[PDB]
């Protein structure tokens, strides 16, 4: 009795593009032909211009079809879909698609391969090997191994993760916390989303290893309200892991204890900021805390707290499973390891490209993204999210590396890359940066709370062509005001999209070339 395994992604981006209808159509079609299939709802390979990307297990490996719509499915069967027959939508052996093959998926190794919620799938691809090794190590040794890897904070401030863990380990306290920052607030980012939706056991393992390293028994995943799929997948994964003894009071019979729960955010971008996040968890308004206490020492409820981004925590298992030196050899300078870069915006082939630091923007734009979606020339690329600077073409050859970007005023951030073609109006981008700040300001700082709105209104005067030379000066003083009087990068980095647009594209503001 012949049963063909078929993969249809359940990643929310695949879902947005019809994946469920395709899966039901594949099921209906199989039944109408009296053929037996097993439809696996995998993660997304992260090649979104091919989603929904249907894969078929054949003797040659998994082969792919994409993008598949519900209407295409009877024709897919007719062309021999169940045996990998060729079709207008054929893409071949999935792992051979260069966009995928030419990556260094250390963190994203399973994403798109596995059923996200199958412990069997997870453990058949190194899942929980990192934990098994960490369980046989001293807490300080786990900290040292994360230190030696060169891992840095993938939320974008890139603080050295191991030194942060060492602080929490050394603090003296009966209660300690692992806090996973899943606020992923930046436009152009979806790596955290994909981890939580497509490989949540990896996040769980990473936080459990963090718990072992510092002496925490309770963890929280604060996940933005804009990510309902991540939240439901994570709660299901936590239940499955607890029931199989990967969580709870006797993890794999080791006597180690770790409990995990998801908390839903509520639409405030500034709750991505680590202390505003802690305020939110505690049931308060998300106002940034002052720092006479560093959160690693007095964080959640005043306890020593590890606060890390999804990708930072998601990279701990491979670091434990394969070793610090394996991880550290990737990258360049002090940017060790890899980053899941996210190609977004006006991009022909957008999605997830995990590569060692040192890849240049241009390589990513042309060799992976394929240029713009419109087909027009790229004019500006914002890297690192809404607080990142726009890069012009002349910056596309700087290596993506925390230090080389910071030197010229670029922001690697989380690795999101948002492409704008030549139609972009950079004065309006500047307006939006000010507008976005007025919307999200926690309210503690005057240039952030109200200076932003005044920036909107001076920008309006520029957009309608009123007194451009005068009002641009006003925007620059306002930006200098924000750089000098903001308690966090929301206010302090709003000038970065504004000043780069101003300096690189003055003509959009009515100024001479």
């Amino acid at each position: 009795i012949t049963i063909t395994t078929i993969f249809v992604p359940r990643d929310s981006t695949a879902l947005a593009l019809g994946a469920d209808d395709v899966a039901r159509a594949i099921a209906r079609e199989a039944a109408a032909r009296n053929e037996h299939v097993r439809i696996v709802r995998n993660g997304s390979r992260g090649m979104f211009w091919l989603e929904p990307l249907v894969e078929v297990q054949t003797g040659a490996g998994r082969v792919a079809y994409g993008p598949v719509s519900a209407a295409d499915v009877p024709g897919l069967f007719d062309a021999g879909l169940l045996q990998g027959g060729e079709h207008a939508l054929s893409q071949g052996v999935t792992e051979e698609i260069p966009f995928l093959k030419q990556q260094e998926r250390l963190t994203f190794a399973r994403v798109g391969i596995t059923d996200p919620l199958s412990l069997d799938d997870y453990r058949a691809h190194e899942g929980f090997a990192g934990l098994e090794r960490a369980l046989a190590m001293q807490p300080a040794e786990i900290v040292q191994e994360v230190t030696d890897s060169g891992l840095r904070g993938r939320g974008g401030a890139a603080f050295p993760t191991g030194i942060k863990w060492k602080t929490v380990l050394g603090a003296q306290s009966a209660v300690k916390y692992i806090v996973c920052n899943a606020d992923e607030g930046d436009s152009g980012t979806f790596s955290d989303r994909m981890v939580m939706e497509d490989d949540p056991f990896m996040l769980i393992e990473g936080m459990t290893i963090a718990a072992l390293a510092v002496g925490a028994e309770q963890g929280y995943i604060y996940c933005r309200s804009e990510y309902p799929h991540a939240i439901a997948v994570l709660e299901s994964a936590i239940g499955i892991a607890n029931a199989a003894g990967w969580l709870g009071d006797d993890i794999r019979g080791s006597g180690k204890r770790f409990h995990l729960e998801v908390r839903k955010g509520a639409g405030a971008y500034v709750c991505g900021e680590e202390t505003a996040l802690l305020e939110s968890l505690e049931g308060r308004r998300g106002v940034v805390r002052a720092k006479p206490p560093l959160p690693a020492l007095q964080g959640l409820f005043g306890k020593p707290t590890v606060i890390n981004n999804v990708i930072s925590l998601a990279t701990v298992p491979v670091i434990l499973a394969r070793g610090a030196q394996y991880y550290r050899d990737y990258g360049m300078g002090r940017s060790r390891g890899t980053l899941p870069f996210q190609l977004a915006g006006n991009i022909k082939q957008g999605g997830l490209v995990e590569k060692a630091f040192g890849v240049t923007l241009r390589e990513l734009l042309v060799d992976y993204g394929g240029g713009t979606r419109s087909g027009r020339a790229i004019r500006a690329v914002q890297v690192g999210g809404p607080l990142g600077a726009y890069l012009p073409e002349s910056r596309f050859d700087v290596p993506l590396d925390y230090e080389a970007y910071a030197a010229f005023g670029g922001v690697v951030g989380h690795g999101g890359i948002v492409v704008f073609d030549e139609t972009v109006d950079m004065a309006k981008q500047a307006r939006y940066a000010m507008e976005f700040c007025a919307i999200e300001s926690c309210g503690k700082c005057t240039p952030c709370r109200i200076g932003s709105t005044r920036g909107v209104e001076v920008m309006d005067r520029i957009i309608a062509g009123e007194q451009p030379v005068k009002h641009v000066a006003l925007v620059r003083d306002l930006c200098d005001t924000m750089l000098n009087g903001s308690l966090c990068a929301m206010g302090g980095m709003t000038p970065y999209p504004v000043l780069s647009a101003l300096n690189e594209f003055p003509e959009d503001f009515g100024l001479a070339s």
Partner: protein, 151 residues
């Protein structure tokens, strides 16, 4: 809103650390909004002031204090969807609906909301309705998805 179930939602959560937002989520998820009458119940079970509790509700854009329409359509307005046309889609959505952002249709079927990134940045312009996602949304597809809502 069901006030008796609001008090049960609250009482089940009253010993959770940082209970306020989970309580607010469960009330909104089951009732549609957080009624004013709920605030003294939340305040008293949490040993918080009514003012404190109101301050948290108003701070967080996710939370609404009056019922929305039958469907909340969220149109992403952030930079990735801007780059593939979120602004034109935003203006078409207002005309096709007859209402601005944070507002509800005259027939009560749709409340129009902005959202700042759905994590669909490679497949924009993105739209979310309830928890149903839509990518590559232009004017025609927007009209179509709104068409599907009413019927």
């Amino acid at each position: 809103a069901d006030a008796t179930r609001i008090a049960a939602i609250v009482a089940a959560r009253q010993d959770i650390p940082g209970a306020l937002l989970p309580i607010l989520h469960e009330i909104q998820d089951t009732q549609g909004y957080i009624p004013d009458a709920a605030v003294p119940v939340i305040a008293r079970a949490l040993n918080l002031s009514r003012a404190e509790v109101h301050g948290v509700i108003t701070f967080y854009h996710h939370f609404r204090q009056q019922p929305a329409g039958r469907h909340v359509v969220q149109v992403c307005r952030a930079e990735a969807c801007q780059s593939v046309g979120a602004e034109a889609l935003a203006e078409h959505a207002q005309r096709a609906l007859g209402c601005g952002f944070h507002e509800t249709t005259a027939d009560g079927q749709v409340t129009l909301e902005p959202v700042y990134c759905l994590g669909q940045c490679a497949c924009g312009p993105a739209v979310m309705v309830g928890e149903q996602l839509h990518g590559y949304v232009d004017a025609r597809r927007f009209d179509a998805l709104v068409r599907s809502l009413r019927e």
